[PDB]
C-alpha cells in the first residue's frame, strides 16, 4: 500500500570481468536505503545500507568490488566491478524510515546473471498446443498449453493474451523451468503454462489466444560477433484461433 520501491533493470546479463550498475528508486521520504542479495531464489543476504549521503552498515559480503552512492535527484545505485560468476543473484533494494524497528520495504529485484561467455545466450522458441476434442467432450472445458523451449539463461516472463488483452484467470505457469540437458552446466531451459477456458469459448473461430514470452537477453553494449541474430531482449509469441 502506497508507493513502491522501484528497480531498474529487471534482468541483466553481463560478461565476466565487466562493470554493472543496478538502480533503485526508494520510497520518496524514506531515510534508510539498503541492498540485499538473494541466491538460488531463496537465501537472502544483507550487503549494505546508506543514510544521509553515506554508507552506514556493511556485511562481510560487501566486497571492494562493490560501491554504492545516491547523488541528489539520482537513483540509489549499486555498482559491481569486476563481475564474477559468484555475483549472479537477484539484488533487492529496500527502504525504510528511521529506526532499527522500522519496516523495510523491498523492490521487485534485479536478476543479474554473469556468464563466462555470451555465446551460450539463446532466446526461447514458443509453441501453443490446442485443446483436445476429448477434453471438450468430457469436461466441457478447454485447456491450451504453451511451451517455451531452448532459452538461456533463465530470463523469461510468460503471459496469456485473449482477443488482444492479457488474462490471469484460468492460468497456471510453472514456477520453475526444466533443464533440457540437466547434466550440462549451461543447459538451456523449458517452461510450460496452461490456460483453461470454457469449451463454449474455445469453439469459436473468432476467439484468438496468444502465449507471449518476454525474454531478457543481451544489451546494446554487449559485444556480438556470431552469425546468428544477437540474442537481445525480445518478445517471442505463439498463437491459436478457436475452432467451430
Amino acid at each position: 500500500m502506497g508507493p513502491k520501491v522501484l528497480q531498474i533493470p529487471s534482468h541483466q546479463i553481463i560478461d565476466m570481468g565487466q562493470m554493472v550498475t543496478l538502480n533503485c528508486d526508494p520510497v520518496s521520504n524514506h531515510l534508510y536505503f539498503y541492498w540485499y542479495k538473494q541466491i538460488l531464489g531463496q537465501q537472502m543476504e544483507f550487503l549494505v545500507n546508506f543514510y544521509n549521503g553515506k554508507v552506514m552498515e556493511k556485511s562481510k559480503l560487501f566486497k571492494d568490488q562493490f560501491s554504492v552512492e545516491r547523488p541528489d535527484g539520482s537513483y540509489f545505485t549499486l555498482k559491481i566491478q569486476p563481475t564474477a560468476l559468484e555475483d549472479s543473484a537477484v539484488y533487492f533494494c529496500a527502504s525504510s524510515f528511521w529506526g532499527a524497528y522500522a519496516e523495510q520495504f523491498f523492490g521487485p529485484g534485479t536478476r543479474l546473471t554473469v556468464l563466462e561467455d555470451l555465446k551460450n545466450v539463446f532466446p526461447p522458441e514458443v509453441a501453443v498446443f490446442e485443446p483436445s476434442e476429448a477434453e471438450i467432450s468430457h469436461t466441457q472445458k478447454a485447456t491450451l498449453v504453451c511451451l517455451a523451449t531452448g532459452f538461456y539463461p533463465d530470463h523469461v516472463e510468460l503471459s496469456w493474451w485473449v482477443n488482444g488483452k492479457e488474462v490471469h484467470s484460468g492460468v497456471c505457469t510453472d514456477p520453475q523451468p526444466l533443464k533440457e540437458q540437466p547434466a550440462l552446466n549451461d543447459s538451456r531451459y523449458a517452461l510450460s503454462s496452461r490456460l483453461r477456458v470454457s469449451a463454449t469459448f474455445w469453439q469459436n473461430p473468432r476467439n484468438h489466444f496468444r502465449c507471449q514470452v518476454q525474454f531478457y537477453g543481451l544489451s546494446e553494449n554487449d559485444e556480438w560477433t556470431q552469425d546468428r541474430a544477437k540474442p537481445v531482449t525480445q518478445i517471442v509469441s505463439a498463437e491459436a484461433w478457436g475452432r467451430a
Partner: protein, 202 residues
C-alpha cells in the same frame, strides 16, 4: 546460519492450519519479523513479532518466546493466496537502522480440495504443427503425486493449480512432452501412481 527456519517446505490443505518456526542463537537479536515473498515479487512484511507472547492479526498469529528466542507463525483457515515463501528476519537494537538477517525460508503451498475429480490424460496438438504434441494430465485430486521423469528424454512438469475464477473451479495439471519416436500419452506418466480410473482417450 544465524537464523534457522523450519520446516523447509510445507503443503497445507485449503482451510487447514500451518505452523512455521524460527530459532536463533544470537542473543543480540531484538527485532523479529515475518516476511512473505510471492513468486516473482520482492519480500513484503507480514508482521513484526517484537514482544513476548501471541500477536493475532486475522488468520495469522505470531508468537515470540523471548527467553529462548523462539519465533513462530501460525496460520488458520489457509487460503490459496497464502502460498508463498515465508521468511523469518531479525535485527539487533541500535539507534541506527540495521540490515536484516534472514532465515532460508519455508515454501508454503496451499492445495485445493478437488470436489469433482476427473483424472484424464489428453493429447494436445501444436496449433502450427499438428504433428507435434504434449500430454496433459489434468483434473486429478490432491491425493495424486506427479513424479518426475526417470527418462532424460521425457520432460514432465510439476503439478500446477489453475483457478477459473468466474466458475469457482480449480484444477490440477501437469504437462509431459518428448521427441522420442515411441512416446505416447498412454505411457507419459508411467512413473507416477495415477488413479486406476484415469481417462485415456483412444
Amino acid at each position: 546460519q544465524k537464523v534457522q527456519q523450519s520446516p523447509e517446505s510445507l503443503s497445507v490443505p485449503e482451510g487447514g492450519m500451518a505452523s512455521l518456526n524460527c530459532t536463533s542463537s544470537d542473543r543480540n537479536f531484538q527485532y523479529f519479523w515475518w516476511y512473505r515473498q510471492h513468486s516473482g515479487e520482492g519480500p513484503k512484511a507480514l508482521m513484526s513479532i517484537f514482544s513476548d507472547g501471541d500477536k493475532k492479526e486475522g488468520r495469522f498469529t505470531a508468537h515470540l518466546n523471548k527467553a529462548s528466542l523462539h519465533v513462530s507463525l501460525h496460520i488458520r483457515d489457509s487460503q490459496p493466496s497464502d502460498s508463498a515463501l515465508y521468511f523469518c528476519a531479525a535485527s539487533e537494537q541500535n539507534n541506527y537502522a540495521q540490515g536484516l538477517t534472514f532465515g532460508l525460508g519455508t515454501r508454503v503451498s496451499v492445495f485445493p480440495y478437488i470436489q469433482n475429480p476427473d483424472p484424464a490424460v489428453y493429447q494436445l496438438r501444436d496449433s502450427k504443427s499438428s504433428d507435434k504434441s504434449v500430454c496433459l494430465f489434468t483434473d486429478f485430486d490432491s491425493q495424486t503425486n506427479v513424479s518426475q521423469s526417470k527418462d532424460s528424454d521425457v520432460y514432465i512438469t510439476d503439478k500446477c493449480v489453475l483457478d477459473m475464477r468466474s466458475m469457482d473451479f480449480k484444477s490440477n495439471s501437469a504437462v509431459a512432452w518428448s521427441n522420442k519416436s515411441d512416446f505416447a500419452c498412454a505411457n507419459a506418466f508411467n512413473n507416477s501412481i495415477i488413479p486406476e480410473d484415469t481417462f485415456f482417450p483412444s
